Amino acid sequence: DENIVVGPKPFYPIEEGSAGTQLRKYMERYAKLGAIAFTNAVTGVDYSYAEYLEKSCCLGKALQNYGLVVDGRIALCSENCEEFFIPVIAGLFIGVGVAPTNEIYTLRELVHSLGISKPTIVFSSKKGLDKVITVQKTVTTIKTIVILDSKVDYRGYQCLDTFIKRNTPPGYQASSFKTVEVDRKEQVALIMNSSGSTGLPKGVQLTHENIVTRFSHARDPIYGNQVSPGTAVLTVVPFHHGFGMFTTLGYLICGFRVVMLTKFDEETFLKTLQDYKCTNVILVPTLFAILNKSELLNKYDLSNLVEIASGGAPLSKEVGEAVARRFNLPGVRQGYGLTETTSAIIITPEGDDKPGASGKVVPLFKAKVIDLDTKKSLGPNRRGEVCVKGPMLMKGYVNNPEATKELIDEEGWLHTGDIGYYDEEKHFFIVDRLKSLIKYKGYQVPPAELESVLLQHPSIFDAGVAGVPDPVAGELPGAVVVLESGKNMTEKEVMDYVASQVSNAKRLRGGVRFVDEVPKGLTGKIDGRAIREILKKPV
Numbered sequence: 001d002e003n004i005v006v007g008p009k010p011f012y013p014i015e016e017g018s019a020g021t022q023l024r025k026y027m028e029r030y031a032k033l034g035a036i037a038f039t040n041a042v043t044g045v046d047y048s049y050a051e052y053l054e055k056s057c058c059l060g061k062a063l064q065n066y067g068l069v070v071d072g073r074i075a076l077c078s079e080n081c082e083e084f085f086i087p088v089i090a091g092l093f094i095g096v097g098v099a100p101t102n103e104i105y106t107l108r109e110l111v112h113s114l115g116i117s118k119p120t121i122v123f124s125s126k127k128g129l130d131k132v133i134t135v136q137k138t139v140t141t142i143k144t145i146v147i148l149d150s151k152v153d154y155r156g157y158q159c160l161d162t163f164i165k166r167n168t169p170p171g172y173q174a175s176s177f178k179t180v181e182v183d184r185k186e187q188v189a190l191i192m193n194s195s196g197s198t199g200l201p202k203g204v205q206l207t208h209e210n211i212v213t214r215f216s217h218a219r220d221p222i223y224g225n226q227v228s229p230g231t232a233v234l235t236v237v238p239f240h241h242g243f244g245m246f247t248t249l250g251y252l253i254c255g256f257r258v259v260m261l262t263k264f265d266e267e268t269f270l271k272t273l274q275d276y277k278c279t280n281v282i283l284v285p286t287l288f289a290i291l292n293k294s295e296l297l298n299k300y301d302l303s304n305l306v307e308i309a310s311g312g313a314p315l316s317k318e319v320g321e322a323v324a325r326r327f328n329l330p331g332v333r334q335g336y337g338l339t340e341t342t343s344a345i346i347i348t349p350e351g352d353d354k355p356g357a358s359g360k361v362v363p364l365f366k367a368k369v370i371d372l373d374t375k376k377s378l379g380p381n382r383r384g385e386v387c388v389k390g391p392m393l394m395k396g397y398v399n400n401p402e403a404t405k406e407l408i409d410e411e412g413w414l415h416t417g418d419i420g421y422y423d424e425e426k427h428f429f430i431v432d433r434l435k436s437l438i439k440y441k442g443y444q445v446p447p448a449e450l451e452s453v454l455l456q457h458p459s460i461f462d463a464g465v466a467g468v469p470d471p472v473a474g475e476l477p478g479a480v481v482v483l484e485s486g487k488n489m490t491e492k493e494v495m496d497y498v499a500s501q502v503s504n505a506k507r508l509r510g511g512v513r514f515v516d517e518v519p520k521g522l523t524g525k526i527d528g529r530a531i532r533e534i535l536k537k538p539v
């Protein structure tokens, strides 16, 4: 079938050994070099590769001495912090599955998530502690809570350093520690949760084979970023999420300095770029609003920045192109993936640009676009559902065979739930989620296309679009808008503006509501249910 798009061979073949063995190999190289692995942009704290590797090895041994066996389970519950990956790496080193979660989860989300992954130990931030203690009242199999981001015991709980000290031989040498080999294709490495689900979180099981495949992409000269001392990546992406997890682990394989930024004001962003001589940025497109508006760019030395990359949510072509222009870059690089595909499976290839494109199929993957009704494959420039297949496909959801069957079909193709198309040169364009399409009469209007128009308005800081129920037409497109500081637009002004830029079908017949924050999930996808609720309330 000539409609199937097949990714090329990777420059670097997948290496032997577990994901833990590969991380240990590379981290030890950069440790001996003397390089910095993690930096907190706001506090300036650094962890060298040597320190990060040593603590990860020591924690691995500590978890074994505690009594965890291969295929056991631990979890994190933490906002981004520079210590986040110590339990992740330790788990990978010893064959103990790791379930990352974020402090920002609601209690309903967290109790469900940890109830599925069933961690023996939870590594909690100070901020997340109360939620973890609450969850433990329901998920009574959580034996121990360890404080991740404290150098001292806290509220009666051992901190990470204490847990390590109490569970290792005095004078234990990390250099003696051995990574544990596993059955790579079968052994669960991570249990992940997607953002923006309409239901409660499912546990996505990712294997070592999934992760070592990612490691080839991450360092690829075309589909990743190359090893080069002094590379510093400013990252704003949630670490617990696949987007933050697999970019960050990839950057460690690459030897980069991971410059973790948790404050998103323009001044801190730009100061961070300058002060740490950042070469790369990785973000969710929500951050572009600040960059296109900033009047401060030439106050900072931004000469080191050579790449801005976006993922997780639709990026307006025009917004991205304006930001690339401001930073004098050729374009914004992009990746597209799902938690269930480990990482990005469509990435903009270096040297193979196309305006508006999401990118091309990554090495070792295949992709097709199917007709929404017949499920048959489509040629170029035909919209339908993107389907993918390749060695980063998850093992399956935890204890949910029905959901697995719905996602990955009888021919092994993962149905992404996204609308897209590919052009004659095989560049893929991801439009929006199928579930988000607004059924106005016989049209299927993608909110992202209307959101793009709204974001392009200089008085509109943010926007989200969803469908208002309508007896005659089914659904009407409506918008929730956040105005820029000091600016006003009426509902009519917004509607008339949009009407001047779009087809008749795409008019905001469902109206406009003004809010302080557009409801979105943790990686920037619009919360359609929440938007519909706002639009339903009378002004």
Ligand SMILES: Nc1ncnc2c1ncn2[C@@H]1O[C@H](COS(=O)(=O)NC(=O)c2csc(-c3nc4ccc(O)cc4s3)n2)[C@@H](O)[C@H]1O
Residues within 6 Å of the ligand: 193, 194, 195, 196, 242, 243, 246, 247, 309, 310, 311, 312, 313, 314, 315, 333, 334, 335, 336, 337, 338, 339, 340, 342, 343, 344, 358, 416, 417, 418, 430, 431, 432, 433, 523, 525
């Ligand atoms: N680039 C994109 N454009 C438009 N939509 C995008 C998108 N990426 C994710 N999405 C949306 O998120 C949904 C998946 O949500 S999710 O489960 O929470 N998972 C994700 O969003 C997810 C998991 S891994 C990942 C990426 N890894 C990367 C590595 C490098 C890079 O430069 C960019 C990326 S994005 N994203 C998709 O189905 C799609 O709707």
Ligand SMILES: [Cl-]
Residues within 6 Å of the ligand: 195, 196, 520, 521, 522, 523, 524, 525, 526
């Ligand atoms: Cl989201």
Ligand SMILES: [Cl-]
Residues within 6 Å of the ligand: 194, 195, 196, 197, 520, 521, 522, 523
């Ligand atoms: Cl979310």
